[PDB]
Each structure stands twice: as structure tokens, then as C-alpha cells.
Design a protein around this nucleic acid. Structure first.
Ligand SMILES: [Zn+2]
Ligand SMILES: [Zn+2]
Lengths: 110, 97, 147, 94, 79, 84, 92, 98, 80, 109, 94
DNA sequence: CTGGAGAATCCCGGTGCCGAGGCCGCTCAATTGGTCGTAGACAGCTCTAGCACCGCTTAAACGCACGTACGCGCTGTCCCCCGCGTTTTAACCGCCAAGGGGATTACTCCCTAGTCTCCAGGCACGTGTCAGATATATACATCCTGT
DNA sequence: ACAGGATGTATATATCTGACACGTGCCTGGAGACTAGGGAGTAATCCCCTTGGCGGTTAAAACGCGGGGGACAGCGCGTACGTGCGTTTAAGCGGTGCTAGAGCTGTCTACGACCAATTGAGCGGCCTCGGCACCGGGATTCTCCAG
């Protein structure tokens, strides 16, 4: 009888839950008060990050002729993208493996 | 009879392992190792399968990183053979010793 | 994509032909082209026209074409097979390169051979140690090879 | 029967929006959720500090944008700040 | 004990091969397992002191993830 | 010969300054923000990332609009030849 | 009168706005901070033929993929100037 | 007859001289000029405190001396006593700055 | 303000390296030492200026400098 | 008229402030509530650590025939005691310098 | 005329209690203040994570000693736990 | 391998100073005394999941020969880096002057915490089908010894 | 450089299967509406400190020249490790069984946040003298060339 409740995520055209982010911020022991636009901005930033990661992983999986993302595609994508590599150079992925590279002196004379 | 000269089987198995993702350490001896490393702090601990898999993944990642760094050291030393001097040099440069 | 890229390369050159040099297809196969290049002015090759063929790759322009002389030329960086050692043809290849431009690079190499990266080491000795008689060797070859 | 929260549904929507014909494995989905949690923790910790040092008490968009700028490398930060700002602006416009 | 020998020589060889190593000298296996065990009590000592602080008698994967997190070795895929 | 005036008018509409609304003075677009103002419009506004967008100037080096300067000078010649 | 150099200058514009790497009329601009212009998809074949950092196509090195931005300053002008040139051909 | 030491003895004595004290080694005025030139690429007309430039210094020579400590051991592992440009790049790649 | 990266004199670099205790220095070290020292500068001041401008002040404090050093895992003592 | 004001530091027999640590913790945004014994325990830990640092610095200073502790003595003490070296291996001391060491290969023979 | 906080008095008291006839420099005093701060934020931040991981809301002596055991390597942790427990016991005794 | 010459280094004494050390407000941040709502300790029930064990498979681990390619020691070189005298340049110290911007207080108001009500979007739990794993049969690329 | 034999190695088709993508039921956390209270944004003012310049000193830097140590290419030798094959062993799987400890709900009380009144502890400021930095001079020692 008041109004139809619209989610704050749909208000800003986002899929990530703005309310959940706001709750985590207020219960995350970060400050005694949190601004209104902070969760909206944070959700958009996280959405951009995960979208870039997902599109790179999908490109890798389609290059591997698979329709499901396994950790190998994520490892290859983030370690092939130079800047994502430095952003996530200090993290370890289970079942991710390493990258195919051979030192120049090790390969035969040919 | 046929005989591969030393240097090609190594390269082919490097290629085979660099695309693989399975764990290179056997599960049972590693579980027995961690269960005895952890027993000197507290008696009769219990471990979850997820926890032991996490230990195995983390230690194998650390070892493969250490090996690629010490291989870099080996090429820098005008060699192709790993020797413990390179291991120690990498350990000390990375600030672990 | 490779074929269409070839079409516009020949189209504009048709409306704007090069001053001295010329090139074109030798048939329906657009990947194989023959060119006639004349010796640079005031150079040992002056007066002679050298003939060479072009082999477009399947992914052109993303890869350099295979080009070699069909006319023998005396050059420290060119062998008797017509093979040419040119830097822009190996490493700094870039789709932005066009047949008209790369040909002028050849002319410049004719005027400025690179003994530092020879394909025939003996000719490189000829050019650096005494450029004067290297001209004499180069010019006589043009009469018997390029004409 | 306890209820636990994850980001799997949202990650799945993002995937079906970017590549409408791709799937996620359970291990890959867990890795993605852990990555998102790690990024959230980094951003929240940096923003909370930036608020604390300047004798501030509120987590606003400006210092979280600043935290993104310090943590995200290069033009990753440039695209992220722009996309966050447009989202906040359009949220405020409605 | 003797469980440190459980990491057999071919295991070190194949770890090195995944690392891009061409050949191994005979004086590498007893040092790799020493580095391994040093890392193991570096991590397990934190995992168990998390568990005992949790009033738990088992070692959870979350505690291990936290122990790796403090040592700059964050792990993805376990929550 | 008659649509030429409409063409020219659309030309300045797509190239003229939106702050000055007259002849441009070495205008430079900082990037994704749609600013067609002259450089002197922002010569003293440098700071706060932008006069409007408030987007920080990540391109510290002057990304000179060589092509756009070419376009505006060709627009000048088309204006000159059109108005005989 | 003066029509011939009018079309010469028209050729000048279309040359300046042609895909330098592709020779294809750029339907909507895609520019890097090097201010080069692409007709799309040239960058994706660039990033497919190699698995590393990209190299600047006309210039030396000013691109690492996806550093471009959706420049729309010429998108409206492409079809506009095309309409004027075709109409002027029809007009005269 | 002029007196000249063999190459290396004065090198070791000036190793000892600089490994015992803590004086600043980089000249302050050119250092702060370089720092200001670095900063002008981000914001114009920025003002710096003497304490801030001193802290930037303290960080500067500390990082450089650490890098040189690493590359010296890198060179001696290379079975030589002269540091080469490849050694510092190896040191910077091992630690993870590239 | 241009052209002071060569202001880091050759004897200054030699003295820095000898504080680390190197015996013999090749002639091909100085340029890339300039380069790496450079890189460290745009790695630190890039964060320092952002710290300052967030507070909406145009003067860079030593507090912000040590702040940027701390956030890179190379914390500094002696400034607060 | 209530009672003589006794500091919580004097209650726990410490010189480090206890109420000040409690205030810092409660305004430090770590939890909405803080236990009573946490600041007391933390103050004792800090006091022990600084006492160790100061006694090592004083020993190093009296070794160098000086009565005032300067950053050189602090750096020497930290890099000489390996435990504190491991604790503080990622922090540099202003005007701290380096400890005199030379590789055996460099020494002439 | 603002009022500034430091640990100078307490550091000086501990110095006089340990070595009664030893001085201190101003730069050394600032370094000591920075060190004691850095340790304070390290311990407090670790205690915050211990409290949050166990779904607890109070930072007590248990969480602080757990953090001390995590950060202090070996012998210092053994000494620090003993000294802190002694102080807590004596405080509870009064 | 054993001695003088020189040069740097170390040790000792007189001198001036400014920074460490100490004392006087005083103000606010510490204390003390009540009060209340609540989070953690504690008890009890449980059942998921971890631990232990037995039997069959066989891949992987282990041991031994070999011979070859790489680690490593000795040799010559020349050139590149180091020790040192000389001239120059800009760092460095001291002083002075203008002011912009950092550092406070007043005050308001507008943003945000807190609360109650309502519901739907997200989580727990079946659920079948297709992407993916595996077998087997290939075609095919690449090493390797002989020519 | 080339070629055939042999060892891997990428490819396609067929078949099982269980993990995922979806669907359904349900609830609590998010949303809407309202309220009150203080965080801070703006304006005004004060002045510490940054910036800029000028002038004299000189110490450090640039430059150069001789010259010798070492980085490097080369060669030869010798042990050591990749490659392969025959002989185990224990990982691996499965299947079963047991129960301890994690995980949940329900109480209940100590206990920490909160507020009000008070006072003394540490800080700003303001002296004051000796630890030391410096200058000068004499004694000690290590490298180097000659013997
Ligand atoms: Zn304008
Ligand atoms: Zn194109």
C-alpha cells in the first residue's frame, strides 16, 4: 500500500546486491557510519572486475573448445593479462597449474 | 635398438606437466607427513580432506615457484643443471633466509 | 580478409601508379605477384630493371609476404637465389606496410647496403673495404643480369 | 539447515550477460567467489583506513574511489572509477 | 617417522619438470624436502594455533586458508 | 550547391567549441569525457580532473589531436572555397 | 567551378579517416591514447596472432589491448559526409 | 716515484668507511629536483615538505642499498666479482618486481 | 623542471653500491640503476599525491610519504 | 570523596598506559566492544618488547662509548639479534645505515 | 596550539628503568614511537580477524594472546605470553 | 718469503654549543560510581564426517648398466675498469623577503543511524540431461642414426 | 642436409555418467516510511612554513691517463646423470563399520557500553648545562716495492 519495493541494485542497473554490500560494510567493523553511495560504487567496481575476469576466462575456454570454465582457464587468463597478473601475482589457484614456457638455452640447438 | 639421447624425454615431460593440473605428490605419504609435522605441536589432531588438499596444493605451488626461480639462477650461472647453491641463492634473495 | 585487403592495395595504386617501379598479378592467384624495379638513380644499378616475385601469406597483411629477386643482383645482403635480408620484412612487419612503400625501402637498400647483417659475407667485404670497385662489380652485373 | 550467503547467482548472471553460452564448474565458481571476497576485503580495508587517517567517520564514495585508485593497477582503475561513478550518478538520478 | 622420505625422488623430478627444469643433480632431493618441511611447520604452526583458539580439535580448511593468508600466500578455492 | 550550407552548418555543429561556441584554440579532448571546449577553456580549469566529468587526467602527457586539428583546418578550407 | 580540388580535398579527408591498418571506412571510431584509429576487429586479430602485449600498429608501442576507448566523435560524421558527397555528386 | 695502491685496497677501505656511518650519499638539491620532476607528471604546482623529501630520500637509498646487496651476491654466485646489468635484473626478477 | 635524472651522479651511485659492499662495478650499471630508481619514484609519489589530493590539500606531507611506503610493505620509521 | 584515583597501569604494575590503549582500541574500529583484560595484556606485551629493544640499544651504545641512543644503535641491535631481525625484516630505520660485512670472496688472499 | 599524543614519557620511563644512566635522541624517540605504534596496529588488526573468524564480537585477552603468538616468532612469544599473563593476573588480583 | 716508506688510521686532549633533561601551569582525558541490556559461557542433543580396517589392482616407485654430454679446472688475452692528479661546477650554507596555503573555530543542515512493517529474491533441496571423460582406432609430426 | 624407421602425438567416433542448470518451496534480510541527532561543509581568520632569490666557499664532480686484473673464449678431461629395462609396494579404490567431535537450540548471568561528576597526568612552553662534534696534534698500523 506504500509502493512497490525496487532493489537498490536495479536502481543503479547492477546485478551485485547493493543491500548485501551495505550490510557487510556496516557489520564489517570499518566505520560507525557508511555513506549511501559507497555500496553502489563498490558493487560496480566488483562487477567490472568479475566481468573482465569472466570474459577472459570464456575466451580461454573457447580457445580450449570447452563450454564450462575450469580453474585452468582462470589461471591462464589472469596470468596472460599482464596487469591482472601483477594485481593477482601473490595468489594461488587450486588445480590451476603453471604456464607453458621454455627457456631459450634449454631447447635444442636445432 | 632405439635410444633417445638425453634431453628430449626431459623436454617432452616438461611439456606434458606444464599443461597438467593434477597434484604431483601422492596423497597418502603427504597425509602421513602432515599428520606427523602437526603432532609435535598438539597431540592427536584431526584433519579434513579439504584441509589436506589445501596443504598439498599450497606446498606444490610454493615448490614449483622455487624451482622456476632456481632454474633462472641456473641459466644465470651459465649452467643447465640445478645445484643447491642456486636453491640457497634464490631462498636468500627472496628474503626467506 | 586477406583477399579483400589485396584488392584495395592494387585499386589505389591503379589510380596513383608509382613513378618508376611497377607490379601486378601474374594470374587469377592474387597471392603471387611479380614486380619490376629499376635501379636507383645515381647508383651502380642505374639503368637496369630487376624482376622479383611476391608471395602473399594466407593471413596477409598480418604476415610479411615471401619476396625474392628473379633477377640476379650483386648485394652484400642478397644471395644468388634472389633471397633478400630486410629488417622490415622479418621483425617490424606491420599491416600498415604497403607494397608501394616497401619497394622504396628496397631502393634505399640498393643505395645503402647493410654489410653488418650480410647474406653473402664475401660481398659485404667488397662493399666495406672498397666501395668504389664494388660499384664497378655491381654495374657490370646489371648489364648482364638486369638488362 | 543454516543459510549461507555466496555470490554464485550474481556471478552467473554476469556470465550469462557477457558470454551467453558459457558454464562454470563448482571449483571455478568457488575460486571466483573467493576472489570477489578478497577484492572486497582489500577495498574495504583500504577505504576504512583512508577514512580513519583523516579523522573522518563516514565511508563515502570519494575515499573508496581513492582506495580503488591505489589498489587497482593502471587503466583497470581508470575504467573501474568511471563505471562506478556513472552507476552512482544514475542511482542518484532516480 | 621417516615420513619425510614419503616424497619420492620422481615426485621432486616431476615438480622440477613442471617448474621448467632440464636436469637435476644428486644433491637436490635432500634439500627440496628440507625446504618443504620447513614450509610445513611454518604453515601448520599457524593452522593449529588457529584451531586451538577456536576451541576445536580438528583442523579446518578455513584455518589453513587463514594461515596462508597471513604469510602472503593466499589460496583460492576453499572459501 | 544548396545543400553545401547545411553540410557546413552540421560541420561546425559537430566541431565548434561548446563553451566558447566560436573558433577553437588548440582544443584537446582529455579522453572519455565529451569535452570539445578549447584548451584555454580548461587552461585555468586544469584540476578536479575535468570541468564537468570530474574524471582525473590519467593522460598526463598531452594526447595531441593531430587528426582533429587536421579536420578543423580542412573545415576552414572548405568554408573558404564554399564562400566564394 | 573549383569542383576538382573540392574532390581532391574530399580525397584528403577520406585518406585521413581511412583505416591505416585496414583500409576500411571506420564506421565508429575506436582510438587508443596514441590517437590511432581502427575500424574494429583489427585489434582482436592482433591479439589472436600473438599471446602477449600488443605493439602500436602505425606508431611504435602505445597499446596493451583494451586500452582503447569508445570514441564517437566521427561516428556521426561518417554517414553525414557520405550523404553530402553522394548528394553533391547527384547535385552536380 | 708516485705511490699507487693496487686496484681494490682503496675499494675495500671505502667499503668499510661507508658501512660504518649513516650520512646521506645522494646530493639533496638534485634529489629534490628529481623528486619534484617526478611529481609534476601527476599534479601541477605541488608543494613539498622538507620532512617529506627527506623521507623519500631515506626510502630511496635504503631500496638501492638492498638491491645492490642482492646483486652483489648474484654476481659472486656468477663466479665473478664485477656486477653486471644482468645481475640486477635477475635480482629484481627473483624478488618479484617484474 | 626537466633533465635531472642524470643529477644522480656516477660517484653517488658508486657510493650507494659500496654501502651495499660491492668491490668492482662495471661501467654499464649506471643507466639502468637510474631507470630502476626512477621506477621506484613513480611507484611511491603516484600513491603519495593521491593520498594528498584525497585530503584536498596541495602540500605533500611526510606523513603521506611514509603512508605510501607502508602500503607497499616497506614501512619507514622516524617520521610518525 | 569517592576514592583516590588509581591508574589502571598502577593496578597492573606497568608503566605503559592502560586507559590510553583502551581508548585507542575502542576508537580503532576493531570491535564494537573490548574486553577488560585485553588492553592490560597488550600494554604488558608492548612494554616487554620496547624494554628488549631499549636494553639492546643501550648495550650497543655503551659498546660504542656513548651515553645517548641514536638510530645507528637501534639498527645495529635489530640486525644483530636475529629474532628481532625476523620480526622487523621489512622496515628500514632512518639514518640506520647497514652493518659492516664483507663477503670472503672479495677479501684479498 | 593543538595537543599532540606520543609515547615519549613511557618510553623514557622504561629506558630509565632498564638503563638508569643512558640517554636518548629525539630521532631515536620518534623511531621508538613509530615502532610501538606499528606493533599496536599489527596486534589490534590480528585480534580483529581472530574475533571475526570465530563469529565473536568481543576482543578479550584470549584473542590478544592468540595474535601475539601468531606474530611474535618463537622466544619473544614465549616471553610475551608470560609477562602479559602475569600482568593480567596481578590486575585481576586488585 | 722479509724489511723500510708512506699513507691512512687510530688515539688523546682542549673548546664551544645546542639539544637532552628538567620544572610550572592546566586542561582535558583519565578515573570512580551506578545502571541495563546482552553476548558469551554453559548444558544438552545430534549425526555428519572423520578415523580405522581388509582385500584386489597395478602404476608408480626402486634398483642397475651404460655411455654420453655437461660440470669443471687450466690457459691465454685484451680490454675494460680502477687509482690518481687537475680543472670546473654547482652543491651548500647563510640571510632575507613575500605570501599562499595549512591550520584553527562558528554554525548550520542535511545526511545517516535506528526502528517498525512487509514481502520477495535468494537459499535449501530434488532432478534429469548433455558436456565431458574414456576407449580405441587411426593419421601424423618429430627424433635419431645412418648416409 | 636428407631419409626411413620408430616413438610419440593430435584427431574422430562411440559410449556412459554424474555435475549442472533449472525448477519449487520457503523465510529473513532487504526495502519503504518515519524520526531525530550529530558530522561535517562552508566561511572567516592567523600565521607557520614553503618558495624564491642572492652571495661567498669549496668540496665534490668531470675529465683524463696509465696500467693491470679479470671476463671471457677455448680446450680437455672426468665423473654424473638421463635413458632404458626388470623387479617389486604401496598408492589407490572400494567397501564397511564406528564414534568423536562439530554444529545446532535454549538458558542465564556476568559484564562491558554508557552516562555523570571529579581530578591529576601528560603535554606545551620555557629554561639550562654537559655529551659531543670538531679541530688539532701525536702514536699505530697496513700495503707496497725492493731485496
Ligand atoms: Zn572554447
Ligand atoms: Zn581495419
Amino acid at each position: 500500500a506504500r509502493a512497490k519495493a525496487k532493489t537498490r541494485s536495479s536502481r543503479a542497473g547492477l546485478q551485485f546486491p547493493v543491500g548485501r554490500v551495505h550490510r557487510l560494510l556496516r557489520k564489517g567493523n570499518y566505520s560507525e557510519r557508511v555513506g549511501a553511495g559507497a555500496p553502489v560504487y563498490l558493487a560496480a567496481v566488483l562487477e567490472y572486475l568479475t566481468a573482465e575476469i569472466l570474459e577472459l576466462a570464456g575466451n580461454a575456454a573457447r580457445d580450449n573448445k570447452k563450454t564450462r570454465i575450469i580453474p585452468r582457464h582462470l589461471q591462464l587468463a589472469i596470468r596472460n593479462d599482464e596487469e591482472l597478473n601483477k594485481l593477482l601475482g601473490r595468489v594461488t589457484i587450486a588445480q590451476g597449474g603453471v604456464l607453458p614456457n621454455i627457456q631459450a638455452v634449454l631447447l635444442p640447438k636445432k | 635398438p632405439h635410444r633417445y639421447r638425453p634431453g628430449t624425454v626431459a623436454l617432452r615431460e616438461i611439456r606434458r606437466y606444464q599443461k597438467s593440473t593434477e597434484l604431483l605428490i601422492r596423497k597418502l605419504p603427504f597425509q602421513r607427513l602432515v599428520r606427523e609435522i602437526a603432532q609435535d605441536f598438539k597431540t592427536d589432531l584431526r584433519f579434513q580432506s579439504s584441509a589436506v588438499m589445501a596443504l598439498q596444493e599450497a606446498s606444490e605451488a610454493y615448490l614449483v615457484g622455487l624451482f622456476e626461480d632456481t632454474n633462472l639462477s641456473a641459466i644465470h650461472a651459465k649452467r643447465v643443471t640445478i645445484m643447491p647453491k642456486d636453491i640457497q641463492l634464490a631462498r636468500r634473495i627472496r628474503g626467506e633466509r | 580478409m586477406a583477399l579483400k585487403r589485396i584488392n584495395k592495395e592494387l585499386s589505389d595504386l591503379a589510380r596513383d601508379p608509382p613513378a618508376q617501379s611497377s607490379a601486378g598479378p601474374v594470374g587469377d592467384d592474387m597471392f603471387h605477384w611479380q614486380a619490376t624495379i629499376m635501379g636507383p638513380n645515381d647508383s651502380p644499378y642505374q639503368g637496369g630493371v630487376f624482376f622479383l616475385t611476391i608471395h602473399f601469406p594466407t593471413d596477409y597483411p598480418f604476415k610479411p609476404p615471401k619476396v625474392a629477386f628473379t633477377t640476379r643482383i650483386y648485394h652484400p645482403n642478397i644471395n644468388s637465389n634472389g633471397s633478400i635480408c630486410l629488417d622490415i620484412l622479418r621483425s617490424q612487419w606491420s599491416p600498415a606496410l604497403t607494397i608501394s612503400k616497401v619497394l622504396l625501402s628496397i631502393s634505399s637498400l640498393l643505395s645503402d647496403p647493410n654489410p653488418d647483417d650480410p647474406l653473402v659475407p664475401e660481398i659485404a667485404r667488397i662493399y666495406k673495404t672498397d666501395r668504389d670497385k664494388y660499384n664497378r662489380i655491381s654495374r657490370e652485373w646489371t648489364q648482364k643480369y638486369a638488362m | 539447515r543454516s543459510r549461507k550467503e555466496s555470490y554464485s547467482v550474481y556471478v552467473y548472471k554476469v556470465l550469462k550477460q557477457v558470454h551467453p553460452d558459457t558454464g562454470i564448474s563448482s571449483k571455478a565458481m568457488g575460486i571466483m567467489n573467493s576472489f570477489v571476497n578478497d577484492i572486497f576485503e582489500r577495498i574495504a580495508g583500504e577505504a576504512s583506513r583512508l577514512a580513519h587517517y583523516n579523522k573522518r567517520s563516514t565511508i563515502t564514495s570519494r575515499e573508496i574511489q581513492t582506495a580503488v585508485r591505489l589498489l587497482l593497477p593502471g587503466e583497470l582503475a581508470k575504467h573501474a572509477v568511471s563505471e562506478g561513478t556513472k552507476a552512482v550518478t544514475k542511482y542518484t538520478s532516480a | 617417522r621417516d615420513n619425510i622420505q614419503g616424497i619420492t625422488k620422481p615426485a621432486i623430478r616431476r615438480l622440477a619438470r613442471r617448474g621448467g627444469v632440464k636436469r637435476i643433480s644428486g644433491l637436490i632431493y635432500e634439500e627440496t624436502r628440507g625446504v618443504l618441511k620447513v614450509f610445513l611447520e611454518n604453515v601448520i604452526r599457524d593452522a593449529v594455533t588457529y584451531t586451538e583458539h577456536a576451541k576445536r580439535k580438528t583442523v579446518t580448511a578455513m584455518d589453513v586458508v587463514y594461515a596462508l593468508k597471513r604469510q602472503g600466500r593466499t589460496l583460492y578455492g576453499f572459501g | 550547391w544548396a545543400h553545401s550550407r547545411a553540410a557546413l552548418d552540421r560541420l561546425e555543429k559537430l566541431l565548434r567549441c561548446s563553451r566558447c561556441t566560436n573558433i577553437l584554440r588548440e582544443p584537446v579532448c582529455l579522453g572519455g569525457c565529451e569535452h570539445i571546449f578549447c584548451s584555454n577553456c580548461v587552461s585555468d580549469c586544469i584540476g578536479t580532473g575535468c570541468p564537468v566529468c570530474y574524471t582525473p587526467a590519467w593522460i598526463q602527457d598531452l594526447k595531441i589531436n593531430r587528426q582533429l586539428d587536421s579536420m578543423i583546418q580542412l573545415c576552414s578550407k572548405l568554408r573558404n572555397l564554399l564562400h566564394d | 567551378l573549383r569542383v576538382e580540388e573540392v574532390q581532391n580535398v574530399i580525397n584528403a579527408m577520406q585518406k585521413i579517416l581511412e583505416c591505416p591498418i585496414c583500409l576500411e571506412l571506420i564506421k565508429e571510431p575506436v582510438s587508443t591514447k596514441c590517437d590511432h584509429i581502427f575500424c574494429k576487429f583489427c585489434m582482436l586479430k592482433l591479439l589472436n596472432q600473438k599471446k602477449g602485449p600488443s605493439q602500436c600498429p602505425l606508431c611504435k608501442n602505445d597499446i596493451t589491448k583494451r586500452s582503447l576507448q569508445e570514441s564517437t566523435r566521427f561516428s556521426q560524421l561518417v554517414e553525414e559526409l557520405l550523404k553530402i558527397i553522394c548528394a553533391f555528386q547527384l547535385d552536380t
